[PDB]
């Protein structure tokens, strides 16, 4: 079944315009030879498929990297490309240009007789539809993200600073088995509350405030994502009202996502809610994305997306409202779309609890 995924490669290549592809993104580089190390390629022929690496990574390479050959190069990895496109036959090589830089395309480019030819989405495509297996462990992921948020409820209260709730995140879903954090946590206390991107900072928690906490645990090389937003004490009527419409948005989100509607229609479930009671001024990102091997990749959930949803994909549905000078509310859940509608992977409580 690397076997697999290779073939399913190879078919997008006529249409790419190529018949070979050289792979150095690490999430490409993860998901197509299931390789977890830090160095190497992928070189991929109509006929053939290899991993090239340097000396001290073959012995991991020969086991993770099943269904490749495993090609060690004698210093320049560059050369060792070149000398293997030549060895495949392949006449028109693609590369992933989106992670490509500059200076490594115009090395690549000089050193290889092919034409170069730059593509995007290749091994995104296979990405985008989960496996039973890494369904299994995005839902281990948004478990260990449930337990944090139990956890951190018992640790926030006035006078803590948004980091050290950072830190205890952090802390406890490395205790309950993630590598770490799957991005910069936010805690956004307070008129924080109204930064969609508020990472948490120096500012101390005090009474009255909302707090969101958004936060995921980067398990097995997969990510879950979750958002909840607490109050320490007690809220004003304004920051309730909003924080109603945001929870009533989004389970017509969970409840509405199924296989079939386009990005902009599972966006139309939240953002709909939100406009019709007068705040669509207010939800200024979308409805969510996708998550796997990367905190963000496709589809999006979002009014732009005519992407068409399908079993196996796994996105965040994560609606707010932001009010400057007043504050903002997010709640996010991360789910696996079936053919009758979704799977919530993340359990955690959305009624407002008030700590
Ligand atoms: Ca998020």
């Known amino acids: 079944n690397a076997m697999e995924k290779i073939e399913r490669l190879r078919s997008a290549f006529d249409e790419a315009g190529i018949d070979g592809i050289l792979l150095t993104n690490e999430h490409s580089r993860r998901y197509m030879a299931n ?51 030549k060895e495949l036959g392949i006449q028109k090589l693609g590369f992933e240009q989106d992670t490509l830089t500059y ?25 985008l539809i989960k496996t039973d297996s890494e369904i299994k462990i995005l839902k281990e992921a948004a478990q260990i993200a449930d337990a944090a948020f139990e956890h951190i409820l018992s640790f926030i209260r006035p006078g803590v600073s948004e980091i050290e709730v950072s830190n205890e995140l952090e802390f406890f879903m490395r205790k309950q088995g993630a590598t770490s954090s799957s991005f910069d ?129 796994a996105v965040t549905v994560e609606p707010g409202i932001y009010i400057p000078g007043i504050g903002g509310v997010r709640i996010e859940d991360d789910i696996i779309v079936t053919s009758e509608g979704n799977e919530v992977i993340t359990k955690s409580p959305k009624e407002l609890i008030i700590l």
Do not use: W
């Not at 390789?35 to 022929?45: D, E, K, N, P, R």
């Open 35 to 85: 390789f977890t190390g830090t160095a190497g390629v992928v070189l991929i022929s109509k006929k053939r498929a290899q991993f090239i690496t340097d000396f001290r990574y073959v012995e991991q390479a020969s086991k993770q990297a099943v269904g490749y050959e495993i090609v060690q190069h004698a210093g320049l990895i560059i050369d060792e490309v070149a000398k293997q496109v």
């Open 103 to 127: 200076s490594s395309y115009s090395a690549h480019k000089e050193a290889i007789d092919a034409e170069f030819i730059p593509t995007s989405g290749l091994v995104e495509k296979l990405r």
């Open 185 to 313: 946590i936010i805690v956004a206390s307070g008129l924080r509350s109204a930064l969609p991107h508020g990472v948490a900072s120096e500012k101390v928690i005090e009474t009255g405030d909302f707090v969101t906490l958004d936060f995921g645990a980067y398990y097995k090389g997969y990510c879950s994502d979750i958002t909840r937003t607490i109050a320490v004490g007690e809220p004003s009527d304004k920051l309730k009202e909003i924080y109603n419409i945001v929870l009533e948005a989004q389970l017509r989100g969970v409840n509405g996502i199924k296989a079939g509607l386009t990005g902009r229609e599972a966006d139309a479930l939240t953002r709909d809610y939100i406009t019709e009671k007068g705040y669509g001024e207010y939800f200024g990102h979308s409805t969510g994305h996708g998550i796997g091997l990367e905190i963000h990749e496709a589809p999006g959930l979002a009014f732009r997306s005519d992407t068409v949803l399908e079993p196996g994909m």
